[PDB]
Amino acid sequence: MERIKELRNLMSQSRTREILTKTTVDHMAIIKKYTSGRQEKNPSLRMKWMMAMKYPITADKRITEMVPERNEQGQTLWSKMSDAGSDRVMVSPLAVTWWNRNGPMTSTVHYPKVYKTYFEKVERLKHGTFGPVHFRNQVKIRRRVDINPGHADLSAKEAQDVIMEVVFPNEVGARILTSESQLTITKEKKEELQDCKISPLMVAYMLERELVRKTRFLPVAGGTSSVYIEVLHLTQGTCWEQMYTPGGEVRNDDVDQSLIIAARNIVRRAAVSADPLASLLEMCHSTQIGGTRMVDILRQNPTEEQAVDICKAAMGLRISSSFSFGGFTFKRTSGSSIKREEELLTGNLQTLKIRVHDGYEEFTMVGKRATAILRKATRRLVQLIVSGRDEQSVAEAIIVAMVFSQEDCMIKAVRGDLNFVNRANQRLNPMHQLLRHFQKDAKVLFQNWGIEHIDNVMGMIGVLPDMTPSTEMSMRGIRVSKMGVDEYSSTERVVVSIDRFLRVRDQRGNVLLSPEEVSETQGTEKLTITYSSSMMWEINGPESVLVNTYQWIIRNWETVKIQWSQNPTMLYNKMEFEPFQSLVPKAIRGQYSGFVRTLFQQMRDVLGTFDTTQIIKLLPFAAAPPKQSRMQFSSLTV
């Protein structure tokens, strides 16, 4: 009613009429950023200079009917002079404090729900639990980490339409909402923010900060989750760690990830020790994750991974001998396997190293909206049966199985820019990258796989490149079935035994797991893992391990220098050099050991030869059991 009158007042004029009539809506975007200049090249100096003068601030003109021209002392609060390219009028910083001591009031109960992120930080610092401070040698590594983790369901393209429907429900257009999480969030935020008058723009900005994800490169030690990165200025320093545990609730992805990493590191050390099982138990007791102890997560949390399974079985629990790949849950049912550490090329000519497995083996793939049975050999697929619901479910299962097969028909079907490193020369994982490449569409992998005949057994359905069943000839090894419900609930955990050297065995006597199946990969925990035995660096990472090993031997030089001469075998077989040995490759440990021990021995034999740097350098390599040899080395790899 009042804005249409303003439109009439504008249209009555001549220049403004000419602007309204002869200006399209796509040109409005350009002229709204038209100006003489709005750039300060030193804003600090301008503030210092302007806050020394009267009337440096600007405000709307309706302040003239809300604040008086001057106060009781006679100080003027606003002027009659107007800003340059605006209707706004110049005012002082006294109008502000006048408003804040004598101005109109409102209700501020909606405010902690709009600005939810900020008040969540508040409540999450209030209910936090501090702990001691530990001084030590700290190594930070630079990584991409999340500031805002966002809503895991919305993908950052649905989130903007959600924001549109909540705040601007009539200006959204044709987009209907499809997912159920969208409708849930929409109704929640729509009944919360019902008749607020803060501003739509600020509500939208804050909903974006709530829902969409946001990353940053920073130097990091300890935890990588977002609740631990907002306080990285307080938990981590150059020489000091501060124990801390935020107060809110934690997502379980972080917990299972951190348990997996912790268990991997623990197993990696424990394997090279003399009694692996005792060391493993002592490490699991003396360690905790996000404040909660590790035994609690190990008893409560069901998670599929080899190292977690060894830990659980060592606690006398029932294991799910299983793992994960591409969102599917694999349980081996036949055969052995060994990795090979090999190298190859792609169709786009990028070179890459991978670990290809040995032996014939069968597997029982499982998933959320599919199911499958798989048989394969070294680098070669043997057969695949599928039980998906929709056709694209079978497509997912087939591309996952093809990647899992490690066949050259898949490697030589890679086309386009597929960079196998990050934007900072960081090695991503090859399997995940291939599996991401073939998820846009795997047209070339289907058109290059092959074709076979079929026996037409069971009336089983044929494969589909693009939804075309072929009931007599089809892709090699790939068949299809159909099920309305689950074939079998394979979530049935078994009882096991363990040797000292961490060989898991079923009730019969066969072998199920071993410290060779755990990954050789070095990850970075999402929750801060805290280890309190005597030295707090023996599960922290390779860099810390190196620095702290050499620092320890420096500090204890006074007794190592004399133990090195008399009874040195009791110095090499020492509990401090075991985290180091986990980094030396298993093939060249004893060769290095024999090399170094012969070095030190003939360094003792002839008189007048002593270099403390050599002894401080080569001791962590003489820890291992000695294998003799005849060759020589110019360097030593770690």
């Binding site: 030193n42 600090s44 100096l45 210092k48 200079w49 020394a52 003068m53 501090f130 001691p132 401070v133 530990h134 001084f135 030590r136 040698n137 700290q138 307080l234 320093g237 150059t238 020489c239 000091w240 501060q242 801390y244 620092q551 500090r555």
Partner: protein
Amino acid sequence: EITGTMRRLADQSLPPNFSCLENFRAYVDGFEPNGYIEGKLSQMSKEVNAKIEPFLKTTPRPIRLPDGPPCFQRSKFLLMDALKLSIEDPSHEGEGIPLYDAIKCMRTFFGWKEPYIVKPHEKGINPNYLLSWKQVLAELQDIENEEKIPRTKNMKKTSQLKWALGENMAPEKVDFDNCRDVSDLKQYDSDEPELRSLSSWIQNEFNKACELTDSTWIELDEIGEDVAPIEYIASMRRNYFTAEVSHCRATEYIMKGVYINTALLNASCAAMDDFQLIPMISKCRTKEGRRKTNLYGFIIKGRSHLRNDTDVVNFVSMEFSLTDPRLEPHKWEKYCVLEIGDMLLRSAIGQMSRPMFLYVRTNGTSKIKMKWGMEMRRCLLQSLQQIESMIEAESSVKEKDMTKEFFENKSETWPIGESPKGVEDGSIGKVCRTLLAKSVFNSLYASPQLEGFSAESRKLLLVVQALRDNLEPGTFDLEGLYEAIEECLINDPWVLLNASWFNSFLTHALR
């Protein structure tokens, strides 16, 4: 489609053996390499080279310093030669009318004389400075009889201050078609500055800036209550830091400059046409916990219509001192020095009656220089940051906090200065004060020469470090680097002193 004009510009935008864009495109499309770089290298002269000049101990020569008349003083206020009158007023930093405090601190001195000149300026008119002092006194008197101190005193615009503040000195701005046939019409003078040689007083100023004192000069804001252990650790670290830092003359100069530049900027924006009297006031807490107010002198601001960041506001500085100007007159080239009184110090010489001088000057400043002197407290961070780094670098090694060991036990020391019999070491607090004074002097004596010298000497510092680390360093043109360093040493005392220090460093290093 490229057509018309933009084809022609395309044909005239290629190498010289081409006349059409399309023939060039065809040459590119048919390009297969058949060893061209090898040929062009084989043709090129062997005089085009990158021969490696080794860098050894006997290789680096000293940096040559300029020759000329000795260097004078150029700060905006006196550093070591300054005197303060005090009354022991119990008010904090920004509290209280300053003209009233000034009158009160002038009442407490007995010994005023009829002023007369001791050391003239030799390019000015010294009676005008004398008369300006007398005018200041008359105005301080007629303040008292006004029934309320006004916080802002304007002065009368008379011949003395019009001369001393540069009024109607600018030339008039006209059109070139009205000044063509003028004889001496020429370009603004744009020449190499006058060279000036190093003197001994800058090192004594720096030595006194690094000194302890019997008073406190900085009272810090409160912060929150400490809830975590590391907050308490940081708090004891901070107690030590603040103890070392509040007792230092460099902090006194910080507070002085911040006060004066703040005052000048605010008066300059507020009163652009009026002349204004501005006292130099400071606040301390002496050894017994008593607050003290301190008067260093007076400033008279002139007109300050500053349309631009570099435009200059002129002012007249008056400062009290006890230091005779007849012993280092080359330091006081820009000053007239009067004699204003006598003073009886805590005396073993019966009662002393040492004379008392007033150093008078015309100076000038800009908005950006004021802005940067209005925020000198950042210097306190720089120093302290480095100190904590060192501490942390040992705390990582010996897994414990080491602030107490360093600050109390004086175990570890670092070289700080050169004495007869050679290198002398100091404790972490001495290092802190030395770096603080370095930053303060960088802020007070800032010039483009310092920028240049810092960069070009960073390079040589790093190649020397590479020699000490035994990394086989080398160069391609070292005399070019020296000629580039020496290009920036012209006339600034602070920069020449840094160069002298660098030569001493090369002498004590490179061994």
